[PDB]
Design a protein around this ligand. Structure first.
Ligand SMILES: Nc1ncnc2c1ncn2[C@@H]1O[C@H](COP(=O)(O)OP(=O)(O)O)[C@@H](O)[C@H]1O
Ligand code: BEF
Lengths: 49, 49
């Protein structure tokens, strides 16, 4: 996980940054998976990020 | 698959209690309930249909 953090105005927590970490292996490896996190943990922050 | 839960972000989330409130049935609801049980028994309750 080596993210370029520009245009991300708000603040995210550590586990959502780990959500971007596990989301980094999808587009770079051309793989598609289902992200099913617990409700209230900010999946939309991971998608927007 | 990608799945996390609230136990990793625990000790900052508040407690969650599940209460069960019992309320007795009303008099007209008991008469109408027994009336629908008897009238359903006239139709043989439609259980195995
Ligand atoms: N870094 C953060 N700081 C504060 N609140 C946040 C943060 N990330 C997410 N949230 C809150 O978590 C909620 C996430 O809701 P949303 O992503 O729409 O649905 P869900 O997370 O239930 O799939 C948002 O309403 C937001 O207020
Ligand atoms: F999973 Be969240 F409640 F949209």
């Amino acid at each position: 996980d080596v993210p370029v953090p520009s245009l991300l105005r708000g603040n995210l927590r550590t586990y959502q940054k780990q959500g971007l970490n596990w989301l980094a292996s999808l587009y770079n490896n051309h793989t598609n998976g289902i992200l099913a996190d617990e409700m209230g943990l900010g999946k939309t922050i991971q998608t927007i990020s | 698959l990608l799945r996390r839960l609230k136990a990793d972000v625990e000790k900052q989330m508040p407690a969650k209690y599940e209460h069960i409130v019992y309320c007795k049935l009303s008099k007209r609801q008991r008469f109408l309930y027994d009336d629908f049980m008897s009238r359903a028994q006239t139709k043989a309750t439609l259980a195995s249909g």
